Point group: C2
Chain length 338, copies 2
């Protein structure tokens, strides 16, 4: 109709390197999400936006539309509420740092509603994820941690995305649609260049405090092995800085021993890293967790600097309380089933 | 398979602004033509190549593949054999200049195998186009003019093309696949910038003499109303020059009266323009035909300069012989049916 017209209008603008307006991008993105765009059109939009360069306004509008059509639960009343997300990096299968970090964050006193997709890992740990949306809110409120699976009816992008095989605007929108109404985030991205614009996107989306991170060694998280680039939104201001583990009194180490072959090894390593008596690899994995959980504790508002956040995370990790939070979350969700 | 792999490889190269090699483009283009590419992939390839800029090598390889899968007849033995084609310009419905030019070219002594797609026009003139490929070759050999309809099983590009609504690499390949094995061409393109690269494409495709034309007023032919940009391939050398009607003793005039509402008016105007007693608009249309048929007579080898070609065309147009060639072609094709 006129909804096919605006798609062709958009593609034409994109070929002339003219950015869609937020108005135009909502219309386009809403059309894609409602099956009002053809597959070829979706492939073209993806490729065109990728080569032009997606603008802040385009990504903002698009995420705005995505969250508009997500199931949502409201836990924005909760103090120290935070999410940790990532686009995925160059992977490379590190153990599940963000899953471990979740337990550390919750054990420290903040609350995380981790929006996601590893699930086998958690079930492997005796944690039952067969949870309705209300049982999940119970986890968040009563345990300080809940796992929002899963997350879509993003069904229309799925085929085009695997068929093109390129990173596109869609790799960005996934992490930006928190169903829990969270306002404070650590967001991993796949390049240094994405850090500032995603920070700016979260500003326009009304976020309060955000660290957008990409490490030199290709991770969408803070690396233990190398420097990490940061764009930080705080108090309406966005700044960019660089972080080395040594800045927070943690010695950089290689990622050797942190790459895992499966869920069972990941879980094994997590338990070691969060436990009171850690192996030599456990200590390394613990330090990497401290860097990332520390960023969560900080943007949550529970700690007042990144450094303090890391110190608090480190206390929890070496004190064992995060491991106990795993055990407790397991019992709770087993009870939630009967 | 590995044929989906090379598509994703290609798209990735295109996003990094790396041109496909001819080898890679054949593979890709062959896949699209054999249904081995998805719609989203085709949309993406179109958009990606459009924004990167298609290279000589990419267009060459792609046309090469297109002609590989066309029906072909061999009339390359014929002396002064020529084709006139166009991508289409900014249209804007001028009367069918190239159709009139066909009759002038043939009446002058050259031969044209006009590859195409107006058909109503010709049938309106009593010309029967319900012709098998051998009856068509008979037209070319015995009359000096034949109409190659129609032209494809380019079925796989058709939907993506109307859905995207952008000019793409496909708008270029249509005119470049002469089924008759013609080596001398006048090719209209939609921008000045396309003239030289298409001339270079025809060189790599083994053409002998080519004029690639785009007029300042947006036509993929030589305008009577404005200047026309030319890239010319001749003797293995490509040159670029600019043409005004006055250079060949024809006064530039506005296109007023040359825009037509339908086939019947187009045919009416053609007959006037090719007839012995021309109206004031007939004379203008005749002059525009002289410019374009002259380019055909020239690249055919029948005339040794563009100027001489135009003079010969002009003699035929004002002498009436091209109109008589229409009448004769009509009788011939009516006989070819019984």
């Amino acid at each position: 109709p006129a909804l096919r017209a605006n798609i062709q209008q958009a593609l034409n603008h994109i070929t002339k390197n003219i950015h869609l307006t937020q108005a135009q991008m909502e219309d386009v993105m809403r059309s894609i999400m409602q099956g009002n765009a053809t597959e070829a059109q979706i492939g073209a939009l993806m490729m065109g936006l990728r080569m032009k360069g997606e603008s802040i306004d385009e990504i903002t509008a698009a995420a705005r539309v995505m969250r508009e059509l997500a199931i949502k639960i409201d836990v924005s009343d909760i103090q120290y509420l935070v999410d940790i997300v990532g686009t995925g990096g160059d992977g490379q299968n590190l153990f599940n740092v963000s899953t471990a970090s979740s337990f550390v964050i919750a054990a420290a006193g903040a609350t995380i509603a981790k929006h996601g997709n590893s699930s086998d890992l958690l079930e492997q740990a005796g944690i039952n994820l067969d949870l309705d949306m209300q049982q999940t809110e119970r986890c968040i409120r009563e345990m300080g941690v809940g796992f929002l699976f899963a997350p879509k009816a993003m069904k229309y992008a799925v085929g085009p995305r695997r068929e093109l095989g390129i990173r596109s605007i869609f790799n960005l929108l996934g992490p930006l649609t928190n169903p829990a109404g969270v306002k404070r985030f650590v967001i991993g991205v796949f390049s240094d260049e994405l850090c500032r614009p995603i920070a700016e996107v979260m500003k326009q989306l009304g976020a309060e405090h955000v660290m957008v991170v990409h490490s030199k060694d290709g991770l969408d998280e803070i690396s233990l092995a190398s420097q990490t680039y940061i764009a930080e939104l705080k108090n309406g201001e966005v700044t960019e800085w660089v972080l080395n583990p040594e800045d927070v009194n943690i010695p950089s180490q290689t990622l050797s021993g942190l790459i895992v072959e499966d869920s069972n090894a990941s879980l094994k390593l997590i338990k070691d890293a969060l436990g009171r008596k850690k192996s030599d690899i456990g200590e390394k994995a613990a330090n990497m967790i401290a860097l990332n959980a520390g960023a969560g504790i900080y943007v949550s508002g529970l700690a007042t600097s990144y450094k303090q956040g890391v110190a608090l995370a480190h206390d929890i990790i070496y004190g064992g309380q995060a491991l106990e939070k795993m055990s407790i979350l397991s019992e709770f969700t087993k009870a939630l089933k009967e």
